[PDB]
Amino acid sequence: VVACFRMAPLYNLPRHRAVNLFLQGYEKSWIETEEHYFEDKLIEDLAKPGAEPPEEDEGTKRVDPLH
């Protein structure tokens, strides 16, 4: 268990070998666990006919971007 206490902590690893671990730990810890809600706004904006009747189509209703 002496070796168990003495496995090299990150303060003994080379700087790049610990930056490369930080880059992959920060992801799962923060980037992967970050939540933002845009689904109800993206669909609301994608189903909006944007000035289509004012647009000089002179025809039937064009299918919206969601369609």
Partner: protein, 81 residues
């Protein structure tokens, strides 16, 4: 680079503070040395628990207020706000 350097210095300081204070309690030392007995990936996975408020990471608050500030600027750049 700076974040790991400051975290690497703190991990050596927090190891010295246990290696010159291990004779107060052997059992408490055996519990504070689990961090250094854990594999290096797990060490940096548990040292990166600044988010939320469970706060089992032993990292100081001044280093905590550095990643917590970089992460806000990164989302400002990414447009997530």
């Amino acid at each position: 680079d700076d974040f790991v350097a400051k975290l690497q210095d703190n991990q050596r300081f927090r190891y010295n503070e246990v290696m010159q204070a291990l004779n107060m309690s052997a059992a408490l030392t055996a519990r504070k040395t689990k961090e250094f007995r854990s594999p290096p990936q797990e060490q940096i996975n548990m040292l990166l628990n600044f988010k939320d408020d469970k706060s089992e990471c032993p990292c100081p608050e001044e280093i905590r207020d550095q990643l917590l500030d970089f992460h806000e600027d990164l989302m400002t750049h990414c447009g997530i706000e």
